[PDB]
Write a protein that binds this ligand. Structure first.
Ligand code: TPP
Ligand code: TPP
Ligand code: TPP
Ligand code: CA
Ligand code: CA
Ligand code: CA
Ligand code: MG
Ligand code: MG
Lengths: 524, 524, 524
């Protein structure tokens, strides 16, 4: 068999049937004779390609396969890759390389020093030393991406390799099964369980790897057993807990002092599936106040190592959550009382307040809706006002890299056809990956895009005035017509300058049979 | 003085007065109290920021200064850096890093292993070990970018550094002057001149570094003295010679066999300011046919080392071209005859052939127009049909990375206010950096954008012929409305469905007060 | 032709006829059928291999070729490579890699991520993508090492490549000539010459690239014309000037404040072939005092970029030194004030003072002796007491990496059979590369080795004083018998416990026909 045929066979045997890509000349020999059991999804820019694949991988909880061209194509996708790195997204990125005969003279589109290009944003980066090695390298890529802690990997393939003969021994690769579904040994797990059973005032903190593992329901059981308040770790890329559950206490603020204040008086704090901690603002103080013991369960040795406090256990989040949920005793403490409903903000007849927008979405969206957030100044309000009952209901750029939400919403919608995806995106953020809209239109992927338009980079104006930073240039983004942009890429577009129009637009958008974009005029 | 004040002083004293940027939290302490003698040019995505800065740097023949945010921002720009690497563009890229106090815990927006991120696409990549080192590091960056062979450099700065005290000895940095304006020693230069005088049938091949050095007129004199035909090296990122000069023989095809056939019978071939050679298609054969001797003058050691044939001299192109032009004898041979005018392609009353478009541009554009090309299937016809008399008249993505031309056209137009810039861009390529249009509208930079719309990735459909690949997905991009996209970003838009409308549209565009996009319906 | 035959022809044609190595299985297919016009020099450990090659390259002023095995062999040599990087030594390091068929499984002795291994200590690092590419990759290595600024390069070759067919077009590589022998353009050079002519009190600082280019005689003429005092730049790897010439001032102390003090009152300071500057101890102060301008001529863009003061010219040291020496006017100023004579230290009849040793060497050694220095606490005294009249008379580890001088002295002696090499090496330093002695014995390379045995790491004790660092462990090295070590590796050995034994031993060593080691008991 050829390297071409052996590689597609490996891919299908390992459960891959979708290729997200932007084609180039170096990939033509790979994409030719594209198999009838595969699906190719085109996006117009590589950041969109990777964003869509990322959304798809995260929602499906399986690896996604990407095909890009050389250094320029890989390069356009590296911002998206930084998000994928922080979110532990299992992404297999393949980039076509020049023919081996012309690599040395550095012909046009030679990816020079290819393996170094995507570093340090990938778990593994590689260019095979011969064509016959390509299937084996692809097998490595698949498993490196899928093993805990999951993450993006990169494989550079000279285009002449595809037509060459494969090694007959490559068949041994097709059905390899590799597991990292592990948990703490019985002896030490018993000790952990006793420490939790003995806690007088435990608290639980959940990170994105809980949602990735679909460990949400086990964490609900654990919280109910321990009668413990539950927080989501700061800079949250996903939602790991039902937000209207009585134990739920919200998104933690991304500051050192703020977090140790929140945790004060809790004797044991169990952190599951989060780094400790993804702080953002500088808010100096104690990591923990006296009397608090922290125990971290993480799938990532790099996270366990860099925690500035606490004990850590490096294991699979799914296996650990289920073990813990089922081993801890039912505490006799009273179940925490549910957080109060958030107050209704005064809304006049003019431009919409973000709070008003979220209340309205919450009233009108289906219960199994999925939200993506890239409205950077309104994140706290979003978390308080959206009732997210199910797993996989929320996505936010894990490395804070704008350009994620718009394309990721398309990938999520593709992965979850029966759940309505609603992307809430600021007017600033919408531009980074605007051409992703075209893919929604072309494949009829019924994502709803809600653009929050206040004409400015709001989160920066906040980060600014608070440092007393005066005279900062480039904070304003006037003169963008999002309905025109939507029309530009073939997506139905509506506007909402006030509450009445917002309700009407949402009514229409939810009834639509294709992608819809709604431009919302919001207050500054 | 603070690091902030010392660094802006260094920048102004080194001739920098413009910052191209997309802002983020880590940059706020750098951008605050922005000096009144500097201007800030905002673009909505980092690929666009770098593209605009690149165009500006290439046209101005001076380094350009870029400011981006952390890993996500740098990453979004790496495709653009790939082009900048190949074009030897002097770009100073600064990226804001997290505060030193939070780098260890990897707070959100920490650029991990920062200096490795942009590698291998930069000449130098660095993060300073302390705040007081920042001005010295910036000095290194400016000079590393500006010295031959020019190219992009990367500097990562923790945001807390800017408010700190600078080293008082930093003042020594302000007026440093660093020269690489060197040429071959007299004795060896005399030997080279002898070999050129002695050739019975010399040919000259010129690359982009001629135009970067503004050595074009010196090369004209050289070609006229030697009575030698002149080719442009393949995959040309710039135009180094008047295209209607009688010696001019056109753009070399980017193939091994095609070039050695083209050079057959020329006893000495002098290549100036080009890699030897930037082939693209695989076209195996002889690098040179017997009887042909090749001598390369390059500013880049990496180019000289990797040439698979010929002698090489590593020196400054401007100094070498001037010296050669002034030392060679006037040959007694007859001056080459000008190439025949290209044939008129027949044009009916329907969709435009690319040839018609280029003929019409040539008839209507000012004699000092600047063209940018990202119409990938029409490059050969463009080179045959545009009379470009002056230096700095042509730009094409040097690494073959799409997304360059649209933003670069804005930078070039910014650098050359008295020269009408006309970007010819395919419908596929226009999408990679579509949001750049906003910067043109916002700063009123009157670039003309000509969108060649044939609904497909034409150059890929062709490369898919030489390779004979069938059933390739993702080659079609129907359903994009470029007038609406232009409207979306505030740029005046026009359409041309046939020749009459093309003339009418171009006429309106050429006299317009602001940027203008023209959507042209082209064949195939 | 095979890759093997083609590669040895390339080496032969590029002037290489010696392979310095330590063999491994991955190199057997390269080393088999070893050509009769080549010689192999074996050393017992890779730091010794590179050290010997390094000495040979520096003294011969031509590239040297090295063959090591995979990652372990390359790794053992990486300390020696750091010295090579700092000395601009043109070393071509080839490392054998596993067969391409077993790279993927990471069989034993697979050099994983090979090209990254020696970074950042090499100008260029590479593994070819196919067997046919090997001669071209070797061509690139050769030229990269040889172009200014010279330095080490690294090529990793899978062992199965050697027997494969070479590209027939590889013959074009054989006779390629690549030149970087360049100097400043006429206009700016005249400006420089006028600045030097107009200076009222000029000073000259010379670095190792002067001796590397053999520009010593031109620098003497320049200094005589300007009547200028000449210093050698700090941490000097070579000696660029006759140390008893009337202009010579001595070796600059490696401190910021010390140097600006030495240069005070000089209106123009011309630095040639040195970094500005290789400081060592932290001696905070002014880089230059007011009233002094500095102009640096360097072959290395990295040096020009990082100088914290002065202007810079990046050009070939040989060409520039020659041009300047012949262009500047003869000044009528008085020569520098004669330097004082080094004091004779009172010597009892016991252990030797280093000053006694150096005075005795200077009396008894031939006028064209070549010295190597790795006696770290005595460097200042060595420079004050040895009259070195000729070029290529001094070597010292350029990166301060011990283990250089012993093997380098053998390489130098091999390159300069008619000049007596005398390596002065501390008892501590001698151990890093002790096995090199065997190579001197086996090939009968008549190097003389003077071990300064004071039983401690003297320089560290000093450096500890200027820090008031108390209770440092590991500074003493008692119980080493160097005569027994010499016997172990087959080298004649003598001992010198006092002055009369020192004179006797040197007399005998100078008369010997093979290598000789003398152990000298020196004061604590
Ligand atoms: C790729 C990238 N570029 C820039 C930033 C910096 N940044 C953070 S928030 C922000 C503002 C986004 O504005 P918008 O999307 O309209 O949301 P708003 O703050 O107004 O709610 C910017 C530019 C970033 N995080 N990532
Ligand atoms: C960043 C990047 N992505 C993808 C490619 C591959 N590529 C080369 S040509 C081409 C087609 C461009 O189409 P268009 O701009 O409409 O011009 P046409 O070929 O039809 O004339 C593509 C997708 C590339 N070179 N760079
Ligand atoms: C590879 C390496 N290891 C350690 C050192 C640190 N070092 C600098 S000087 C020195 C002492 C050298 O001792 P010796 O050779 O006996 O000379 P002495 O100082 O006594 O004159 C050491 C260990 C170094 N420079 N390089
Ligand atoms: Ca906004
Ligand atoms: Ca097209
Ligand atoms: Ca000692
Ligand atoms: Mg990288
Ligand atoms: Mg005009």
């Amino acid at each position: 068999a050829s390297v071409h045929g052996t590689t597609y066979e490996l891919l299908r045997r390992q459960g891959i049937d979708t290729v997200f890509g932007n084609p180039g000349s170096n990939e033509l020999p790979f994409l030719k004779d594209f198999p009838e059991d595969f699906r190719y999804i085109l996006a117009l820019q590589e950041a969109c390609v990777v964003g869509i694949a990322d959304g798809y991988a995260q929602a499906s909880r399986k690896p996604a396969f990407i095909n890009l061209t050389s250094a320029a194509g890989t390069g356009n996708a590296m911002g998206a890759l930084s998000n994928a790195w922080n979110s532990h997204s299992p992404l297999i990125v393949t980039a076509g390389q020049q023919t081996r005969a012309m690599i040395g003279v550095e012909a046009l589109l030679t990816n020079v020093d290819a393996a170094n290009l995507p570093r340090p944003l990938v778990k593994w980066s590689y260019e095979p030393a011969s064509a016959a090695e390509v299937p084996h390298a692809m097998s490595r890529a698949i498993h490196m991406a899928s093993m805990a802690p999951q993450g993006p990997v990169y494989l550079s393939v000279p285009y002449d390799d595809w037509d060459k003969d494969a090694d007959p021994q490559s068949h041994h690769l097709f059905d390899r099964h590799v597991s990292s579904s592990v948990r703490l040994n019985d002896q030490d797990l018993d000790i952990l369980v006793k420490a939790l059973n003995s806690a007088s005032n435990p608290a639980i903190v959940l990170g994105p790897d809980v949602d990735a593992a679909n460990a949400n329901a086990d964490c609900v059981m654990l919280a109910e057993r321990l009668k413990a308040p539950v927080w989501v770790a700061p800079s949250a890329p996903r939602c790991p807990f039902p937000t209207r559950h009585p134990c739920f206490r919200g998104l933690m603020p991304a500051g050192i002092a703020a977090i140790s204040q929140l945790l004060e008086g809790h004797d044991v704090v169990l952190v599951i599936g989060a780094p400790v901690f993804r702080y953002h603002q500088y808010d100096p103080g104690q990591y923990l106040k006296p009397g608090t013991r922290l125990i971290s369960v993480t799938c990532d040795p790099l996270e366990a190592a860099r925690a500035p406090m606490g004990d850590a256990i490096v294991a699979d989040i799914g296996a650990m959550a289920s073990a813990l949920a089922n081993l801890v005793e039912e505490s006799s403490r009273q179940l925490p009382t549910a957080a109060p409903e958030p107050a209704k903000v005064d809304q006049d007849a003019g431009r919409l307040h973000p709070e008003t927008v979220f209340d309205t979405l919450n009233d009108m969206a289906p219960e199994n809706a999925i939200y993506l957030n890239e409205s950077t100044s309104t994140t706290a309000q979003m978390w308080q006002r959206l009732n997210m009952r199910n797993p996989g209901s929320y996505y936010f750029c894990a490395a804070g890299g704008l350009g994620f939400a718009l394309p990721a919403a398309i990938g999520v919608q593709l992965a979850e056809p029966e759940r309505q995806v609603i992307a809430v995106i600021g007017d600033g953020s919408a531009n980074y990956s605007i051409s992703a809209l075209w893919t929604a239109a072309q494949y009829n992927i019924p994502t709803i895009f809600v653009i929050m338009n206040n004409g400015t980079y709001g989160a920066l104006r906040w980060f600014a005035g608070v440092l007393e930073a005066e005279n900062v240039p480039g904070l304003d983004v006037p003169g963008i017509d999002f309905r025109a942009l939507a029309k530009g890429y073939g997506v139905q577009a509506l506007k909402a300058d006030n509450l009445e129009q917002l309700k009407g637009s949402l009514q229409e958008a939810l009834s639509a049979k294709g992608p819809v974009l709604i431009e919302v005029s919001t207050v500054s």
